[PDB]
Amino acid sequence: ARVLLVIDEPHTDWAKYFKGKKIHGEIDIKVEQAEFSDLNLVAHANGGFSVDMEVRSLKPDFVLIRQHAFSMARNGDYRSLVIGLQYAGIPSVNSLHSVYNFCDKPWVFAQMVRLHKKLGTEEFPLIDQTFYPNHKEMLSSTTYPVVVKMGHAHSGMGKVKVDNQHDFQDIASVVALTKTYATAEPFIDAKYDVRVQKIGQNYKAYMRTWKLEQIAMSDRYKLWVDTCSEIFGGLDICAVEALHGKDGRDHIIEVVGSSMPLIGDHQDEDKQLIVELVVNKMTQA
Amino acid sequence: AARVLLVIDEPHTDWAKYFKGKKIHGEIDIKVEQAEFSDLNLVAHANGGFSVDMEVLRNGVKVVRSLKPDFVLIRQHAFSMARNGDYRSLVIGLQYAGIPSVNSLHSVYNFCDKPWVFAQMVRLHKKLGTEEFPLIDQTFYPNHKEMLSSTTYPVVVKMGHAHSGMGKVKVDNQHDFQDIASVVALTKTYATAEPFIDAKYDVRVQKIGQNYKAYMRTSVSGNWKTNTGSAMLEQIAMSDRYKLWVDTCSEIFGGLDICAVEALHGKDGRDHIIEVVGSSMPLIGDHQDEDKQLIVELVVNKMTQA
Amino acid sequence: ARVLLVIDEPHTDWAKYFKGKKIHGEIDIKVEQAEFSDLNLVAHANGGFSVDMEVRSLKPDFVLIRQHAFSMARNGDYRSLVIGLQYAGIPSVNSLHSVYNFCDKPWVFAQMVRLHKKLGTEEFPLIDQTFYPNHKEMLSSTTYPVVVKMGHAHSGMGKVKVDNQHDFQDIASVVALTKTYATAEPFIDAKYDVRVQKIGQNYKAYMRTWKTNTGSAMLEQIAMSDRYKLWVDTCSEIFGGLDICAVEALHGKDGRDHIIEVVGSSMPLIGDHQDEDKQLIVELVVNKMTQA
Amino acid sequence: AARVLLVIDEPHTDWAKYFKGKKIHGEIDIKVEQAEFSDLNLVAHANGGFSVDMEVVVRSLKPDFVLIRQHAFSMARNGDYRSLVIGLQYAGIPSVNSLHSVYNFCDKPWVFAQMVRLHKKLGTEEFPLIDQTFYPNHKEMLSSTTYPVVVKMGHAHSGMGKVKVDNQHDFQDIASVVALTKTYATAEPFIDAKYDVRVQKIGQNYKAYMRTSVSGNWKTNTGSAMLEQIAMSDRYKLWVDTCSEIFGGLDICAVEALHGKDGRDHIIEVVGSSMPLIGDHQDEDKQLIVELVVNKMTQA
Ligand SMILES: Nc1ncnc2c1ncn2[C@@H]1O[C@H](COP(=O)(O)OP(=O)(O)OP(=O)(O)O)[C@@H](O)[C@H]1O
Ligand SMILES: Nc1ncnc2c1ncn2[C@@H]1O[C@H](COP(=O)(O)OP(=O)(O)OP(=O)(O)O)[C@@H](O)[C@H]1O
Ligand SMILES: Nc1ncnc2c1ncn2[C@@H]1O[C@H](COP(=O)(O)OP(=O)(O)OP(=O)(O)O)[C@@H](O)[C@H]1O
Ligand SMILES: Nc1ncnc2c1ncn2[C@@H]1O[C@H](COP(=O)(O)OP(=O)(O)OP(=O)(O)O)[C@@H](O)[C@H]1O
Ligand SMILES: [Ca+2]
Ligand SMILES: [Ca+2]
Ligand SMILES: [Ca+2]
Ligand SMILES: [Ca+2]
């Protein structure tokens, strides 16, 4: 029986979705589930290794990662477990390589910058964004308001709207206390934001209208996510988020990996899709 | 043999000049060494032995010269949560070596957490009452989790331990407060929130030894932070009111030789004390040269007592 | 009913030890107990405040601190809670001031360095320790072996025996990764080590028979000498006074004593009089609460 | 319009000297700008605009290329320059080694993992990777099968954080120290080495040096030691060739291995473009690096 470790919150019962699924028609799949916070491991270059949960130990043959491997908030650093999993040679979705490299939002943005550079604005409208290695480079902005995003954090954390020079200077003084990097980008007066996802070969576009209706995929939206899905060796599960300004201009602000939240009326379909995806990946091994 | 005095301060002020010709007991000369925290290190032995190492730029070659100070004057902030602003171990080292200081090393170490110092003012306020010691209403949050909301807006949020306006922001509403709380989570430290005061001006009452001065500061750049941007300073008369403020605060942590009390003066006529600073308070106004001389007098007298 | 918050692990049922105890003869005492890791609070300059536990909230009239307030190990920093309690103006044992100042072992040691300078080696034999603000000052050592103690940690953590120059250099390079200070001191070929404790006005001395801290060891309560009493009485005066404290010393095979540390109100209770010590602590707390 | 090359290296090597007279496509000049990570900062815009600020006066530049000779990360205070690497990539500035490999080289265990893969593929005979155990944090550090071992704490250089442990009691003391570093660590068999070897590869040039101590230290990079260049073998060529393909390709790299007294080799690490130049051919290596960079610059 093949052991699949799914790093995810307890709500979604992954064992339920993998129930009955078999590799090559007879190799059963056992599902072990737990959050990053309850895991630890030890890996040997020789191949031996063990993942400890809660305390029960297991040896996953594969891993599905649905949780953020890193957050600059307290207790959110799980990079060393990602390193350990890679060290033990365990295959995963998304790839451990992409997971590790997704641990710095500006590092992932840089990849889109390169994409934007090749494709041009009419094909890939990447939002205008500025990167600051530290607060010392934060002096002012061309226009206001702007959205400042501090360090590497999720669910709105560390993201503030700044309406003027004085406030910017204050916010910059706060970046100094985070002792990390930050970005600033034009605040978009949005009519709504859209997220284009891609799981394996399935695509879906959702329209949500400061901080849900499924729409039709377009060739434009497909290009956005197809191009983004190729970074860091390829992302099996990813999505592109863009803001649609009242003036009709689109602005791509981010690309998410395998921890992207499932949304809308089809969360069930998407989980099954992820299951189909992981089963196929496990099959090849 | 000359007594060695180490002054920890930025190079803008040349203390050697101010201590020139000052003698202890009339015949002992004072040799002044000066440097910033960033260029200092030391080693201290329980038996009394010790050495202070100072990095100096002697013509391109980064040279380290060691000294054995008999006394120390601390004019720089020993701690800041900004990168490279943590000099607490040097303060511990100086105390470990038993070096006398101004202000006392004990007070300096205990001044490394603004809310910890503020707690002393809270005690003094419960004791003296609002009429005589109008401490501002402030709330202390050990971490971001307890930052849910405020009774009134706008509020001024002060993150961790920092200076010169660093880490302080004005928040006008509930939604913005929640965003700021999420930022606090990224600083991974404590934070305080206090009522934003529409101030006519702010004032600072200082006490150097037995010399008192009060200054009023007004912004002329539309900065609610009057220490940020150009502003106007006006020295004002000392009052019994101002004197009580700095006298009572000057007694904390065993006694502060150099200290000051900052208060905001509302447009509605109400005063609000927001902080007491130690021996690293910036000299201000048009009497800075006098204050430096007052500090020499104080230090020389403290050195004589040893 | 006065509320007493006891910060300690659950192995000790403080509610039981305080059961029946009343202040002034009629005011009952309500005991709330929890570890630092399960606590949070909010304090206002106006006197308002709340301590949140686990989630249930309380308003302690007094606190007894039995847990280390600071450790450089991950998750061990509770200094902000000690600041909060002081900000809320809550009385404590030991005093919150002393607890805060005990959060840097070398800072505490510095107080003993002064006592030693006043008393003299014959009265107060403080061990020959060296303080390094950071690793850059860690070059060598007069003698070997030495014991290096990194940062601020407990129960033997971060402490290592170093036998030679080269090993010292390697260990110094590790201090660099801790990004904090460290101390070095002569390794004592100890016959045994002793701990002289003082809880209120009750004194006890125990002899324990290289880290007698780690693994199985034997304890023998020994007589208090005036010498021992002097060590703990003087150390008990630092930072405004310690209601609970103990001095640790190493006794070398050559007959010499070496004081290596004074612990505060979170000192572990040891030997066979631990129940009595808890009872002495209860008496102490009740006396303190009565005066408020 | 001369091309700007920013070299991130310490003042010792005068890179401008080595690039003097070199021109792209025959006529385009190359201006060399040099500085250490500590004296650099920058700003990058998604629109392409950007600037590098060097404390020389705070002069600012717009490198057309970058050569990185300095470690981008160290867990010692002030050794974290990862955000500058991210910044350079955000600005889309070509580099040697690739900024991608530089960023991924900021965790020794992450790189070692790559060498684990190659070992699984190649076998001990061709790729004798040392027996190493990775610990995410001090909690899994219970004991060792054999002693003595070498504990390598977190991510650091020049011997920092590396200690020899001769027994269980000492392993536990060191485990408690790791707890204080609040990071990962690895443990590996201590090798009674006759000497240790390093096989380097710069572009298409290979070299192999052997180093042995003479100051009494097991860390032969600490104290007086003797270096001796030796002959390249196909065994060595395989080592550096295989590792040079990781993270999209390493322009400059080397594989370090220990040669036990029992005759066995043990590979312990692969370094990137900030590997120190050793031996009697440092001038030649700096020249090979100039050629490599000139070529890379030519292609852009
Ligand atoms: N530049 C901008 N202009 C206007 N609104 C913005 C901008 N950037 C972000 N927002 C708004 O803030 C929301 C959250 O921003 P962002 O997606 O960066 O946060 P996040 O922490 O990555 O979110 P989550 O983790 O919930 O995916 C966006 O959905 C959008 O509504
Ligand atoms: N609650 C407040 N309401 C109104 N203005 C405020 C408030 N708090 C601070 N300010 C303004 O900002 C200035 C700086 O604030 P504060 O003194 O707290 O910062 P700081 O970092 O300690 O600065 P410095 O080191 O210059 O003392 C005050 O002098 C005042 O002008
Ligand atoms: N200099 C020394 N020479 C010899 N043995 C020593 C020395 N320092 C410490 N030890 C031994 O190690 C034990 C624990 O060391 P120490 O008390 O410094 O550690 P700790 O972390 O404070 O421990 P605990 O929290 O148990 O008090 C001592 O009781 C003694 O047995
Ligand atoms: N397992 C081991 N057994 C024996 N000697 C070892 C072992 N690991 C390292 N050494 C010795 O220590 C030296 C330095 O170790 P290592 O290369 O791990 O350190 P480093 O910090 O990466 O140093 P550098 O950056 O100079 O490469 C090696 O050259 C070798 O002589
Ligand atoms: Ca998002
Ligand atoms: Ca102030
Ligand atoms: Ca102890
Ligand atoms: Ca190496």
Coordinates of N, CA and C in Angstrom, one line a residue, chain C residues 137-287:
Chain C
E137 N 34.9 38.3 20.6 CA 35.8 38.4 21.7 C 36.3 37.1 22.3
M138 N 35.7 36.0 21.8 CA 36.1 34.7 22.2 C 37.3 34.2 21.5
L139 N 38.5 34.5 22.0 CA 39.7 34.1 21.3 C 40.3 32.9 22.0
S140 N 40.6 33.0 23.3 CA 41.3 31.9 24.0 C 41.0 31.9 25.5
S141 N 41.7 31.0 26.2 CA 41.5 30.9 27.6 C 42.8 30.6 28.4
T142 N 43.0 31.3 29.5 CA 44.2 31.0 30.3 C 44.3 29.6 30.5
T143 N 43.3 28.9 31.1 CA 43.3 27.5 31.4 C 42.2 26.7 30.7
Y144 N 42.4 25.4 30.8 CA 41.5 24.4 30.3 C 41.5 23.3 31.2
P145 N 40.3 22.5 31.3 CA 39.1 22.8 30.5 C 38.3 24.0 31.1
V146 N 37.4 24.5 30.3 CA 36.5 25.5 30.7 C 35.1 25.1 30.3
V147 N 34.1 25.8 30.9 CA 32.7 25.5 30.6 C 32.2 26.7 30.0
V148 N 31.6 26.6 28.8 CA 31.1 27.7 28.0 C 29.6 27.6 28.2
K149 N 29.0 28.8 28.6 CA 27.5 28.9 28.8 C 27.0 29.9 27.8
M150 N 26.2 29.4 26.8 CA 25.7 30.2 25.8 C 24.3 30.9 26.1
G151 N 24.3 32.2 25.9 CA 23.0 32.9 26.0 C 22.4 32.8 27.4
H152 N 21.0 32.6 27.3 CA 20.2 32.5 28.5 C 19.3 31.3 28.3
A153 N 19.6 30.2 29.0 CA 18.9 29.0 28.9 C 19.0 28.2 30.2
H154 N 18.1 27.2 30.4 CA 18.0 26.5 31.6 C 18.2 24.9 31.5
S155 N 18.3 24.3 32.7 CA 18.4 22.8 32.7 C 19.5 22.3 31.9
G156 N 20.7 22.9 31.9 CA 21.9 22.5 31.2 C 22.0 22.9 29.8
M157 N 20.9 23.4 29.2 CA 20.9 23.8 27.8 C 22.0 24.9 27.4
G158 N 22.7 24.7 26.3 CA 23.7 25.6 25.9 C 25.0 25.6 26.6
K159 N 25.1 24.7 27.5 CA 26.4 24.7 28.3 C 27.2 23.4 27.9
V160 N 28.5 23.7 27.7 CA 29.4 22.7 27.2 C 30.8 22.8 27.8
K161 N 31.4 21.6 28.0 CA 32.7 21.5 28.6 C 33.7 21.5 27.4
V162 N 34.7 22.4 27.5 CA 35.7 22.6 26.4 C 37.1 22.2 26.9
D163 N 37.7 21.2 26.3 CA 39.1 20.8 26.8 C 40.3 21.5 26.2
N164 N 40.2 22.1 25.1 CA 41.4 22.8 24.5 C 41.1 24.0 23.6
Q165 N 42.2 24.7 23.2 CA 42.1 25.8 22.4 C 41.3 25.6 21.1
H166 N 41.6 24.6 20.3 CA 40.9 24.4 19.1 C 39.4 24.2 19.3
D167 N 39.1 23.3 20.3 CA 37.7 23.1 20.5 C 37.0 24.4 20.9
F168 N 37.7 25.3 21.7 CA 37.2 26.6 22.1 C 36.8 27.4 20.9
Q169 N 37.7 27.4 19.9 CA 37.4 28.1 18.6 C 36.2 27.6 17.9
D170 N 36.1 26.3 17.9 CA 34.9 25.7 17.2 C 33.6 26.1 18.0
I171 N 33.7 26.0 19.3 CA 32.6 26.4 20.1 C 32.3 27.9 20.0
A172 N 33.3 28.7 19.8 CA 33.1 30.1 19.6 C 32.4 30.4 18.3
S173 N 32.7 29.6 17.3 CA 32.0 29.8 16.0 C 30.6 29.4 16.1
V174 N 30.2 28.5 17.1 CA 28.8 28.1 17.2 C 28.1 29.3 18.0
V175 N 28.7 29.9 18.9 CA 28.1 31.0 19.6 C 27.7 32.0 18.6
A176 N 28.5 32.2 17.6 CA 28.2 33.1 16.5 C 26.8 32.9 15.9
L177 N 26.5 31.6 15.7 CA 25.2 31.3 15.1 C 24.0 31.5 16.1
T178 N 24.3 31.5 17.4 CA 23.2 31.8 18.4 C 23.0 33.3 18.3
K179 N 23.9 34.1 17.8 CA 23.8 35.5 17.7 C 23.5 36.2 19.1
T180 N 24.2 35.7 20.1 CA 24.0 36.3 21.4 C 25.3 36.1 22.2
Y181 N 25.3 36.6 23.5 CA 26.5 36.5 24.3 C 26.7 35.1 24.9
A182 N 27.8 35.0 25.6 CA 28.2 33.8 26.2 C 29.2 34.0 27.3
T183 N 29.5 33.1 28.2 CA 30.4 33.2 29.3 C 31.3 31.9 29.3
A184 N 32.5 32.1 29.8 CA 33.4 30.9 30.0 C 33.9 31.0 31.4
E185 N 34.1 29.8 32.0 CA 34.6 29.8 33.3 C 35.4 28.5 33.5
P186 N 36.3 28.5 34.5 CA 37.1 27.3 34.8 C 36.2 26.1 35.0
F187 N 36.6 24.9 34.5 CA 35.8 23.7 34.8 C 36.3 23.3 36.2
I188 N 35.3 23.0 37.0 CA 35.7 22.6 38.4 C 35.6 21.1 38.5
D189 N 36.7 20.5 39.0 CA 36.8 19.1 39.3 C 36.1 19.0 40.6
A190 N 34.8 19.0 40.6 CA 33.9 19.0 41.8 C 33.6 17.7 42.4
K191 N 33.8 17.7 43.8 CA 33.5 16.6 44.6 C 32.0 16.5 44.7
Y192 N 31.3 17.7 44.6 CA 29.9 17.8 44.6 C 29.5 19.3 44.5
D193 N 28.3 19.6 44.3 CA 27.9 21.0 44.2 C 26.8 21.1 45.2
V194 N 26.5 22.4 45.7 CA 25.5 22.6 46.7 C 24.6 23.8 46.2
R195 N 23.4 23.8 46.8 CA 22.5 24.9 46.5 C 21.9 25.3 47.8
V196 N 22.1 26.6 48.1 CA 21.6 27.2 49.4 C 20.4 28.0 49.0
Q197 N 19.2 27.6 49.5 CA 18.0 28.3 49.2 C 17.4 29.1 50.4
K198 N 16.6 30.1 50.0 CA 16.0 31.0 51.0 C 14.6 31.3 50.4
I199 N 13.6 30.9 51.2 CA 12.2 31.1 50.8 C 11.7 31.9 52.1
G200 N 11.5 33.2 51.9 CA 11.0 34.0 53.0 C 12.2 34.0 54.0
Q201 N 11.9 33.4 55.2 CA 13.0 33.4 56.2 C 13.4 31.9 56.5
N202 N 13.1 31.0 55.6 CA 13.4 29.6 55.7 C 14.6 29.2 54.8
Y203 N 15.6 28.6 55.5 CA 16.8 28.3 54.7 C 17.1 26.8 54.7
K204 N 17.6 26.3 53.6 CA 18.0 24.9 53.4 C 19.2 24.8 52.5
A205 N 20.0 23.8 52.7 CA 21.2 23.6 51.9 C 21.2 22.1 51.5
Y206 N 21.4 21.9 50.2 CA 21.5 20.5 49.6 C 22.8 20.3 48.9
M207 N 23.3 19.1 49.0 CA 24.5 18.7 48.4 C 24.1 17.7 47.3
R208 N 24.6 17.9 46.1 CA 24.2 17.0 45.0 C 25.5 16.3 44.4
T209 N 25.4 15.0 44.2 CA 26.6 14.3 43.7 C 26.1 13.4 42.5
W210 N 29.5 15.2 34.0 CA 29.9 16.3 34.8 C 28.8 17.2 35.2
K211 N 27.7 17.1 34.4 CA 26.5 17.9 34.7 C 25.6 17.1 35.7
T212 N 25.8 17.3 37.0 CA 25.0 16.6 38.0 C 23.6 17.0 37.8
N213 N 23.3 17.9 36.8 CA 22.1 18.5 36.4 C 21.4 17.4 35.5
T214 N 22.1 16.7 34.8 CA 21.6 15.7 33.9 C 21.8 14.3 34.3
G215 N 20.8 13.5 34.3 CA 20.9 12.1 34.7 C 20.6 11.8 36.2
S216 N 20.8 10.5 36.6 CA 20.5 10.2 37.9 C 21.6 10.8 38.9
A217 N 21.2 11.3 40.0 CA 22.2 11.9 41.0 C 21.6 11.8 42.4
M218 N 22.5 11.9 43.4 CA 22.1 11.8 44.8 C 22.1 13.2 45.5
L219 N 21.1 13.4 46.3 CA 20.9 14.6 47.1 C 21.0 14.3 48.6
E220 N 21.7 15.2 49.3 CA 21.8 15.1 50.8 C 21.6 16.5 51.4
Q221 N 20.6 16.6 52.2 CA 20.4 18.0 52.8 C 21.5 18.1 53.8
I222 N 22.2 19.2 53.8 CA 23.3 19.4 54.7 C 23.0 20.6 55.6
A223 N 23.8 20.7 56.7 CA 23.6 21.8 57.6 C 23.9 23.2 57.0
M224 N 23.2 24.2 57.4 CA 23.4 25.6 57.0 C 24.6 26.1 57.8
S225 N 25.6 26.7 57.1 CA 26.7 27.3 57.8 C 26.4 28.8 57.7
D226 N 27.1 29.6 58.6 CA 26.9 31.0 58.5 C 27.4 31.5 57.1
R227 N 28.4 30.8 56.7 CA 29.0 31.0 55.4 C 28.0 30.9 54.3
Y228 N 27.2 29.8 54.3 CA 26.2 29.6 53.3 C 25.1 30.6 53.4
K229 N 24.7 30.9 54.6 CA 23.6 31.9 54.9 C 24.0 33.2 54.4
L230 N 25.3 33.6 54.5 CA 25.8 34.9 54.1 C 25.6 35.0 52.5
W231 N 25.9 33.9 51.8 CA 25.8 33.9 50.4 C 24.4 34.1 49.9
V232 N 23.4 33.4 50.5 CA 22.0 33.6 50.1 C 21.4 34.9 50.6
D233 N 21.7 35.3 51.8 CA 21.2 36.5 52.4 C 21.5 37.7 51.5
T234 N 22.8 37.8 51.2 CA 23.3 38.9 50.3 C 22.7 38.8 48.9
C235 N 22.7 37.6 48.3 CA 22.1 37.6 47.0 C 20.6 37.9 47.0
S236 N 19.9 37.6 48.1 CA 18.5 37.8 48.2 C 18.1 39.3 48.2
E237 N 19.1 40.2 48.3 CA 18.8 41.6 48.4 C 18.9 42.3 47.0
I238 N 19.4 41.6 46.0 CA 19.5 42.3 44.7 C 18.2 42.6 44.0
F239 N 18.2 43.6 43.1 CA 17.0 44.0 42.4 C 15.8 44.3 43.3
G240 N 16.1 44.9 44.5 CA 15.0 45.3 45.4 C 14.6 44.2 46.4
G241 N 15.1 43.0 46.2 CA 14.8 41.9 47.1 C 14.1 40.7 46.4
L242 N 14.6 39.5 46.7 CA 14.1 38.3 46.2 C 13.4 37.5 47.3
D243 N 12.2 37.2 47.2 CA 11.5 36.4 48.3 C 11.8 34.9 48.2
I244 N 12.1 34.5 47.0 CA 12.5 33.1 46.7 C 13.8 33.1 45.9
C245 N 14.8 32.5 46.4 CA 16.1 32.4 45.6 C 17.0 31.4 46.2
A246 N 18.1 31.1 45.4 CA 19.0 30.1 45.9 C 20.3 30.4 45.2
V247 N 21.4 30.1 45.9 CA 22.8 30.3 45.4 C 23.3 28.9 45.1
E248 N 24.0 28.7 43.9 CA 24.6 27.5 43.5 C 26.1 27.6 43.6
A249 N 26.8 26.6 44.1 CA 28.2 26.6 44.2 C 28.8 25.2 43.9
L250 N 30.0 25.2 43.4 CA 30.7 23.9 43.1 C 31.8 23.7 44.2
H251 N 31.9 22.5 44.7 CA 32.9 22.3 45.7 C 34.0 21.4 45.1
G252 N 35.1 22.0 44.9 CA 36.2 21.2 44.3 C 36.9 20.2 45.1
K253 N 37.5 19.2 44.5 CA 38.2 18.2 45.3 C 39.4 18.8 46.1
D254 N 39.8 20.0 45.7 CA 40.9 20.7 46.4 C 40.3 21.5 47.6
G255 N 39.1 21.3 47.9 CA 38.4 22.0 49.1 C 37.9 23.4 48.9
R256 N 38.1 24.0 47.7 CA 37.6 25.3 47.4 C 36.2 25.4 46.9
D257 N 35.4 26.5 47.2 CA 34.1 26.6 46.8 C 34.0 27.7 45.6
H258 N 33.1 27.4 44.7 CA 33.0 28.4 43.6 C 31.5 28.6 43.3
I259 N 31.0 29.8 43.6 CA 29.6 30.2 43.4 C 29.5 30.4 41.9
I260 N 28.5 29.7 41.3 CA 28.3 29.9 39.9 C 26.9 30.5 39.5
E261 N 26.0 30.7 40.4 CA 24.7 31.3 40.0 C 23.8 31.5 41.2
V262 N 22.9 32.4 41.0 CA 21.8 32.7 42.0 C 20.5 32.6 41.1
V263 N 19.5 31.8 41.5 CA 18.3 31.6 40.8 C 17.2 32.4 41.5
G264 N 16.1 32.7 40.8 CA 15.0 33.5 41.4 C 13.8 32.6 41.8
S265 N 12.6 33.2 41.7 CA 11.4 32.5 42.1 C 11.0 31.3 41.3
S266 N 11.7 31.0 40.2 CA 11.4 29.9 39.4 C 12.4 28.7 39.6
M267 N 13.1 28.9 40.7 CA 14.1 27.8 41.1 C 13.4 26.5 41.3
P268 N 13.9 25.4 40.8 CA 13.3 24.1 41.1 C 13.3 23.7 42.5
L269 N 12.2 23.1 43.0 CA 12.2 22.6 44.4 C 12.9 21.3 44.3
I270 N 13.8 21.0 45.3 CA 14.5 19.7 45.3 C 14.5 19.1 46.6
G271 N 15.2 17.9 46.7 CA 15.3 17.2 47.9 C 14.0 16.6 48.5
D272 N 14.0 16.2 49.7 CA 12.8 15.6 50.3 C 11.9 16.6 51.1
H273 N 12.1 17.9 50.9 CA 11.2 18.8 51.7 C 10.4 19.7 50.7
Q274 N 10.2 19.2 49.5 CA 9.5 19.9 48.5 C 8.0 20.3 48.8
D275 N 7.4 19.4 49.6 CA 6.0 19.7 50.0 C 6.1 20.8 51.0
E276 N 7.0 20.7 51.9 CA 7.2 21.8 52.9 C 7.5 23.1 52.3
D277 N 8.4 23.1 51.2 CA 8.8 24.3 50.6 C 7.5 24.9 49.9
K278 N 6.7 24.1 49.3 CA 5.5 24.6 48.6 C 4.6 25.3 49.7
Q279 N 4.5 24.6 50.9 CA 3.8 25.2 52.0 C 4.4 26.5 52.5
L280 N 5.7 26.6 52.5 CA 6.4 27.8 52.9 C 6.1 28.9 51.9
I281 N 6.0 28.6 50.6 CA 5.7 29.5 49.5 C 4.3 30.0 49.7
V282 N 3.4 29.1 50.0 CA 2.0 29.5 50.2 C 1.9 30.6 51.4
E283 N 2.6 30.2 52.5 CA 2.7 31.1 53.6 C 3.2 32.5 53.2
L284 N 4.3 32.5 52.4 CA 4.9 33.7 51.9 C 3.9 34.5 51.1
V285 N 3.3 33.9 50.1 CA 2.3 34.5 49.3 C 1.2 35.1 50.0
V286 N 0.6 34.4 51.0 CA -0.5 34.9 51.8 C -0.1 36.1 52.6
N287 N 1.2 36.0 53.1 CA 1.7 37.2 53.8 C 1.7 38.4 52.9

